[PDB]
């Protein structure tokens, strides 16, 4: 199977919002957990995203369509985000969003 997340790249700015979109493909079972992952511009450790707030995620099964619009976009909110599907993980290959 695998995960198809858009954009690969979103130069966003302070203030504006930025949605990511992740869809499973090619799979014969359906959608079960999702999960979202920082990896803040500075490290290598790869850190789960906690649903709430200014992230505000949308999930779509039955077209296996999830979604994170992450609101009032920081500088400090830089950096390399994944989505995940679970029924093993299977991960998109991430967004590299710039703010600022």
Not at 52 to 73: A, C, P, Q
Request: net charge positive; glycine share 12%.
């Amino acid at each position: 199977a695998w995960v198809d997340q858009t954009p690969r790249t979103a130069t966003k700015e302070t203030g504006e919002s930025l949605t990511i979109n992740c869809v499973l493909r090619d799979a014969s079972y359906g959608l079960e957990s999702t999960g979202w992952y920082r990896t803040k511009l500075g490290s290598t450790n790869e850190q789960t995203i906690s649903i709430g707030g200014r992230y505000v995620e949308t999930v779509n099964k039955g077209s296996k369509s999830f979604s994170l619009r992450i609101r009032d976009l920081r500088v400090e909110d830089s950096g390399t985000y994944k989505c995940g599907a679970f029924r093993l993980s299977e991960k998109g290959a991430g967004t590299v969003l710039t703010v600022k």
